[PDB]
Ligand binder design. Structure first.
Ligand SMILES: [Mg+2]
Ligand SMILES: [Mg+2]
Ligand SMILES: [Mg+2]
Ligand SMILES: [Mg+2]
Ligand SMILES: [Mg+2]
Ligand SMILES: [Mg+2]
Ligand SMILES: [Mg+2]
Ligand SMILES: [Mg+2]
Ligand SMILES: [Mg+2]
Ligand SMILES: [Mg+2]
Ligand SMILES: [Mg+2]
Ligand SMILES: [Mg+2]
Ligand SMILES: [Mg+2]
Ligand SMILES: [Mg+2]
Ligand SMILES: [Mg+2]
Ligand SMILES: [Mg+2]
Ligand SMILES: [Mg+2]
Ligand SMILES: [Mg+2]
Ligand SMILES: [Mg+2]
Ligand SMILES: [Mg+2]
Ligand SMILES: [Mg+2]
Ligand SMILES: [Mg+2]
Ligand SMILES: [Mg+2]
Ligand SMILES: [Mg+2]
Ligand SMILES: [Mg+2]
Ligand SMILES: [Mg+2]
Ligand SMILES: [Mg+2]
Ligand SMILES: [Mg+2]
Ligand SMILES: [Mg+2]
Ligand SMILES: [Mg+2]
Ligand SMILES: [Mg+2]
Ligand SMILES: [Mg+2]
Ligand SMILES: [Mg+2]
Ligand SMILES: [Mg+2]
Ligand SMILES: [Mg+2]
Ligand SMILES: [Mg+2]
Ligand SMILES: [Mg+2]
Ligand SMILES: [Mg+2]
Ligand SMILES: [Mg+2]
Ligand SMILES: [Mg+2]
Ligand SMILES: [Mg+2]
Ligand SMILES: [Mg+2]
Ligand SMILES: [Mg+2]
Ligand SMILES: [Mg+2]
Ligand SMILES: [Mg+2]
Ligand SMILES: [Mg+2]
Ligand SMILES: [Mg+2]
Ligand SMILES: [Mg+2]
Ligand SMILES: [Mg+2]
Ligand SMILES: [Mg+2]
Ligand SMILES: [Mg+2]
Ligand SMILES: [Mg+2]
Ligand SMILES: [Mg+2]
Ligand SMILES: [Mg+2]
Ligand SMILES: [Mg+2]
Ligand SMILES: [Mg+2]
Ligand SMILES: [Mg+2]
Ligand SMILES: [Mg+2]
Ligand SMILES: [Mg+2]
Ligand SMILES: [Mg+2]
Ligand SMILES: [Mg+2]
Ligand SMILES: [Mg+2]
Ligand SMILES: [Mg+2]
Ligand SMILES: [Mg+2]
Ligand SMILES: [Mg+2]
Lengths: 252, 130
RNA sequence: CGACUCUCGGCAACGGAUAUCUCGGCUCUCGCAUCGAUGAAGAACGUAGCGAAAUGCGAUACCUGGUGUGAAUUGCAGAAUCCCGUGAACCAUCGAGUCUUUGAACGCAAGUUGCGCCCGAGGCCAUCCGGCCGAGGGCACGCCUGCCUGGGCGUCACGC
RNA sequence: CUAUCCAGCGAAACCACAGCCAAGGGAACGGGCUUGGCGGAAUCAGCGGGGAAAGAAGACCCUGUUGAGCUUGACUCUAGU
RNA sequence: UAGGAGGGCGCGGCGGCCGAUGCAAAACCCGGGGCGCGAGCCCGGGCGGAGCGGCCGUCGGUGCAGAUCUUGGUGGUAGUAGCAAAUAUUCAAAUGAGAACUUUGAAGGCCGAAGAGGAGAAAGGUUCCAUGUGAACGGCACUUGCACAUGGGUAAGCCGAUCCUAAGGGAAGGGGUAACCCCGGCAGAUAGCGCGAUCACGCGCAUCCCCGAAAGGGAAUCGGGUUAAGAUUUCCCGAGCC
RNA sequence: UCGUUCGUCUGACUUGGGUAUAGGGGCGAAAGACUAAUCGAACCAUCUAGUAGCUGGUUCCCUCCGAAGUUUCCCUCAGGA
RNA sequence: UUGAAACACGGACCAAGGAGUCUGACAUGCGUGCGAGUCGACGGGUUCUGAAACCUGGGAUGCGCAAGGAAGCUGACGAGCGGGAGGCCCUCACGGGCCGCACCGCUGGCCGACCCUGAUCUUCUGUGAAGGGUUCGAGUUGGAGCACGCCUGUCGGGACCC
RNA sequence: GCGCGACCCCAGGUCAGGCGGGACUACCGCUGAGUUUAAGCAUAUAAAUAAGCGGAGGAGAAGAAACUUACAAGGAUUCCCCUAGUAACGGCGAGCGAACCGGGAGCAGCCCAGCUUGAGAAUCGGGCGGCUGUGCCGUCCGAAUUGUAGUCUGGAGAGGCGUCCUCAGCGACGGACCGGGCCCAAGUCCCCUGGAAAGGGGCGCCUGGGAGGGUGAGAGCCCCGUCCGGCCCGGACCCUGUCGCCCCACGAGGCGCCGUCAACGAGUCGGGUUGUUUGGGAAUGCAGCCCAAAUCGGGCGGUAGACUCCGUCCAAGGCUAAAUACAGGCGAGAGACCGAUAGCGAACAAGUACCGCGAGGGAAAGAUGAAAAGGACUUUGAAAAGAGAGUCAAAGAGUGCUUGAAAUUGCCGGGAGGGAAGCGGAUGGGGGCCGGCGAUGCGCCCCGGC
């Protein structure tokens, strides 16, 4: 967030002073002088016209909040896990009825593309282009004050391409497409892996990024991850199939 | 998308730079697309308009009406052209304003400096076409 | 039935809330360092074909000049060669110029366009080869370096 | 000369809703509550019983760990001599 | 009741998802139809003419009947109180759409010259004069006006300022002061030097600056004319004065 | 403020202009009078959104639970632990 | 307010604005991550829409893992009982026995302050075999803590508004 | 009846020159309150703050130990984190409150005065003159011996010896940094509604360009722009990159040794007392007055005191970027902010109109339409206006004109009323409104073809 506040001096650039009691009017401060309509009008209240606001907004609010580094990492792990489950992506709102396999992984030949037409053509072999079109035709002006606070157009979310060879040109080939985002594999971002707080961004992994996702996040072993002091969280259940638990021979 | 951190993407500042522009800038904004054939000839897509160009409004309520420009009226963001004109209640005749982006320059008033401008805007387009 | 009162709807008023806006504000961030005795900031008065304000400018007065762009200004009129050019423009920009009375304000003062003194381009006649009318321009305060003219047996040497 | 009427012009204080009484009960003096008396459109000009009428966050008194002016044998300081 | 908690309704953003909208969005109005116990919601019709809603997460300048609350509007009071000092107006005629209020004439009256007359100081600043007038204003009215609009007008050797001092005020050197600022006789080669001579020099320098009065002191002007508005003495005519 | 009736009217008289004294200061033939409708301490801005145990107000629905004016201490009794 | 329809005060009516918010410290409760650890918060490298994000250090920075004393200083030598959830074993079962977390109650032990005590050894002033205590500790015989978020409460700030 | 020189001081409209005032964010110095808190209040707190008075810059200030520490010690200044709400200070009450260590950002150290040319002021300024021109050179005056230049600064240094090692300038051409200008992809194709196509359908295209803005309604492709970069013009440059000519000394430095000297800042330190301030407590800084030094010495080592030892530094002269601050100014960029009673007081001729003698106070006020196409003309009226008409998609959007709420008023239609009305619960009578207000379809059968 960027900070926002009212002026330190709002409402307090009038030199008013209450009339006191005995003038058949309330005891609120009133502007001095004469010759204007402003003379005798209330001031310095938050109830006045032209006075303060109650408890004025100040720049030293808590704008930025802190989350533990290990909790960010755990959350990125859960978001990556949720990218792999087709029902989660489809629930989350991506048109995937024609993508070949999950997790959707394309060859490194994608890394070399340069042009946006080439990126579209690449999406055509895959099933992503239904989603990309969904964003492209769902772009529309943001309702409300956002259409004058420099937040004119909104759109949907399209596939998130992840690449492994840094300095590749797919970052520039895919940029112009509305709703489609491109990430590097070292620095995954939660705002992309789970927009809106909802799980299951439709991620398209390139073949370079996919094979080093293990080298980056590691496994259930100390120091296996490229990140220090981090191992994958373990779930509170190994198998979450209540059907199989309850209907197992032991339980039944 | 925008990468240069010197050009504003603010609606307020852009509307300032538009509606407060001086005449030397209003000329550049008063640009019109060339006709398809004259585009084919001069290898340019748009040109700022002149005193005596032949324009052919394509989208106003006066579609299809060819007319020479008679008064490019930079204050009200309009141009007055021959005979594309209406009648007041009393019967006086007044030229209407058509925004320059709604006309196409069918025939062009070749000044020598215009020839130079067409050369520059031609080779700029084509040196990046090739 | 009718008048009056209360009341419901329809329509009309008064009034400008709400709804949609916004060349404005606020907040954060970044780059730079540039006023003035070579007269600043501020103030006053003027200045446009038709202007009062605001914006601009200073008796060259909503501008002069160079450069850049390249055919306008515009509410009305007008002159416009101003059009393949030494070139329009309430255009941009900045080096050449102008910059009224004031104001630290500086000849003296100031409810005064008050009262002075000096130089002096230029002209007149000759009371001389001098004087009169001048265009302009000086004349403040403390201070430094130097120079000029000076003062005091403050210390002296030499002298009548 | 006004006040009254007429032409013309034309405000303000004030206003919870409003305006007939008796007795009772009640925050111990009700326009509203209870039991009665009654109660018939709409206006005119007065008047000063009432509306515990308007004017004013009572000045009389008290409370305040609020002041202020003044005094002195109050407490702590100070110019001056 | 004071109070506490839970679940929800509603306003405005942000990250997401699903949508509506020139075949009519937002808003607002309705003796329209419903849903919920309720906050509230959904639909219908009209005006409207360009945007808007729903769900999840989350955030907030988030919900009004009071505060002699603040700003703006509107009522009843109410066509009511009221418009009453300064004696007084009346009749013809003219203009005009329109006259108790304008203009001319006539008559009656008042001010009664320590005035309701003729001029000035300060103050005002164009109110002065002419022509025209839709509105507003002149607490009734208006053809009218000190109103609105466009024009015009203020002439100085002699009238004043300017000059000199009064009470007093500011100040150069100096004394004080943290510095702005405060003291002027404190005596300092004092602000200024002066006069005769320049064909140059001599003599003097004493209570030593500036400001301060349109009622103090004071170089000089009178008469007659003249303009829509200037002048008595500002212009013209004559005659003077410094 | 107006009307009538009054006080003084050659004097410690009435008055214009100039000028001096400016806030805990001025000035007072003394009333705490006057110092620009303000005076038992002017007015303007700022510290300042002064403080308040005191008065007034404190914004949506439903469901559920639901009291106290009593002890002890306090310059403590309108208050707080 | 014990008590309001009150002859108690505010309210003529309408529309819009209008009053427990922000920040710091602390605390309980709850959620999440890790868990004798936990925080990357000041910096550094990266960052092709980005004040974001990601990486980095820490071998001792904050808190926590040790406390008692004013201080010099010293600094936990290892726990039993009664009731207990729950499990287990025996019986046809009723009933009986065993292990018994948490928590509650009881008694102790060890560290330290104060007191008391004193074999040996030792650098003669130190140690400390044994024995202690109607004393005191915010101790130990349970490692649970750190960080973030939310509400509530106390306090400082204008601090619910006038 | 003198001529001289020095000192000290005059007056000069002398020649040449520097000063004063303005802005307030940030910065430096002085001065300096109280409201408040302590539930009173007087020390304390507010606060070493607000106000007052001055002074600068792009940053200012500080800065190269008379430091801290007690360590295995480190090593200028400034800022951030931690130290730490801790030690300390406080009617030990309210409260207040730093530093060392450590980690980071950036790091650069320097020059004077004194003993030191004495064959000899080697120095500096000014007038004039020249040239190559931010200076150099010549000449003449002056400053100066009461000391200019050079060497030196404690880490040293001066001397003496030594193989030795180290030093110079001018050109070009860029890069780099800054400003400016110009240029740069793609539909305006067909149909429909529409006043307007930027809407819907269909057929297509660009995208290293779908930031934003304009254009007659939701415009990637109409326009300005955005991405990639390209081109050219001008600046300061004083940073380095390579080329070219110029060849680095008997001077200076460094290094090694020697042992002889070894010079170091005064009403200053330091001490008493007073006042203020601090966390600084037998006194943290500062300041006034008095006392007033030291050279085998002086200041520190957070409890005053004397002695012994130890750790440490060298004041009383000066300069110094970087990291840091920034409601002012100039130029930019962004926003989970405000949307005309909001947000700056000011969206607008807002610090304006207006008030006050003056210090000062100080508002209100935004929206026609796509385009004025701003209503010709006819007629009633004295006129404003009305009624027809016309422009427009609509003017009932008609110059305070987008929509147009309630309060409140009028007219039309209905309803009801014996000193209130309104409201709750019953229905009843009027209205007004509801066809999802209320159905006609299922099974069995026979054709007649589907
Ligand atoms: Mg009243
Ligand atoms: Mg405001
Ligand atoms: Mg009448
Ligand atoms: Mg009664
Ligand atoms: Mg009553
Ligand atoms: Mg009754
Ligand atoms: Mg009457
Ligand atoms: Mg009556
Ligand atoms: Mg009466
Ligand atoms: Mg009465
Ligand atoms: Mg009272
Ligand atoms: Mg008390
Ligand atoms: Mg008192
Ligand atoms: Mg006493
Ligand atoms: Mg609020
Ligand atoms: Mg409201
Ligand atoms: Mg209200
Ligand atoms: Mg209420
Ligand atoms: Mg009457
Ligand atoms: Mg009367
Ligand atoms: Mg007389
Ligand atoms: Mg008279
Ligand atoms: Mg007149
Ligand atoms: Mg009238
Ligand atoms: Mg004089
Ligand atoms: Mg006089
Ligand atoms: Mg006189
Ligand atoms: Mg004459
Ligand atoms: Mg009288
Ligand atoms: Mg007098
Ligand atoms: Mg007088
Ligand atoms: Mg008075
Ligand atoms: Mg308050
Ligand atoms: Mg107050
Ligand atoms: Mg009470
Ligand atoms: Mg309590
Ligand atoms: Mg009572
Ligand atoms: Mg009563
Ligand atoms: Mg009361
Ligand atoms: Mg009332
Ligand atoms: Mg640790
Ligand atoms: Mg047990
Ligand atoms: Mg609070
Ligand atoms: Mg107090
Ligand atoms: Mg108190
Ligand atoms: Mg008190
Ligand atoms: Mg200050
Ligand atoms: Mg400096
Ligand atoms: Mg700590
Ligand atoms: Mg303090
Ligand atoms: Mg283009
Ligand atoms: Mg189309
Ligand atoms: Mg657009
Ligand atoms: Mg002080
Ligand atoms: Mg002291
Ligand atoms: Mg310095
Ligand atoms: Mg907001
Ligand atoms: Mg406003
Ligand atoms: Mg419209
Ligand atoms: Mg519109
Ligand atoms: Mg309207
Ligand atoms: Mg209504
Ligand atoms: Mg009656
Ligand atoms: Mg009823
Ligand atoms: Mg019924």
């Amino acid at each position: 967030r960027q900070p926002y506040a009212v002026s330190r001096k709002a409402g307090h650039q009038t030199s008013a002073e209450s009339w006191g009691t005995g003038r058949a009017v309330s005891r609120i401060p009133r502007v001095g002088g004469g010759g204007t309509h402003r003379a005798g009008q209330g001031a310095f209240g938050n109830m006045c016209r032209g006075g303060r606001m109650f408890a004025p907004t100040r720049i030293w609010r808590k704008w930025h909040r802190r989350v533990n580094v290990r909790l960010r990492r755990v959350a990125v792990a859960s978001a990556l896990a949720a990218t792999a489950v087709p029902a989660i992506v489809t629930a989350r709102g991506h048109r995937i009825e024609s993508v070949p396999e999950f997790p959707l992984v394309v060859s490194d030949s994608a890394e070399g593309i340069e042009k946006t037409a080439q990126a579209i053509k690449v999406l055509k072999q895959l099933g992503a282009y239904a989603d990309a079109e969904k964003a492209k035709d769902s772009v529309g002006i943001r309702p409300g004050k956002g259409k004058m606070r420099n937040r004119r157009y909104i759109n949907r979310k399209g596939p998130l391409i992840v690449y492994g060879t840094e300095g590749s040109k797919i970052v520039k080939a895919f940029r112009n497409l509305p709703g489609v985002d491109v990430a590097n594999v070292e620095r995954l971002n939660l705002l992309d892996l789970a927009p809106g707080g909802h799980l299951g961004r439709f991620v398209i992994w390139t073949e370079s990024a996919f094979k080093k996702l293990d080298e980056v996040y590691g496994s259930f072993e100390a120091s296996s991850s490229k990140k220090k002091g981090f191992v994958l969280p373990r779930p509170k259940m190994t198998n979450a199939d209540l059907g199989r638990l309850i209907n197992s021979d032991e339980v039944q | 998308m925008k990468r240069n951190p010197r050009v504003t993407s603010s609606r307020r500042k852009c509307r300032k730079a538009h509606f407060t522009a001086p005449s030397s800038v209003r000329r550049v904004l008063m640009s019109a697309a060339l006709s398809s054939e004259l585009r084919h000839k001069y290898n340019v897509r748009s040109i700022p308009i002149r005193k005596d160009d032949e324009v052919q409004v394509v989208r106003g309520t006066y579609k299809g009406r060819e007319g020479k420009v008679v008064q490019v009226y930079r204050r009200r963001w309009v141009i007055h052209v021959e005979r594309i004109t209406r009648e007041k209640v009393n019967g006086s005749t007044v030229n209407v304003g058509i925004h320059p982006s709604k006309v196409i320059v069918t025939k062009l008033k070749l000044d020598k400096d215009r020839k130079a401008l067409l050369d520059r805007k031609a080779r700029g387009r084509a040196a990046d076409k090739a």
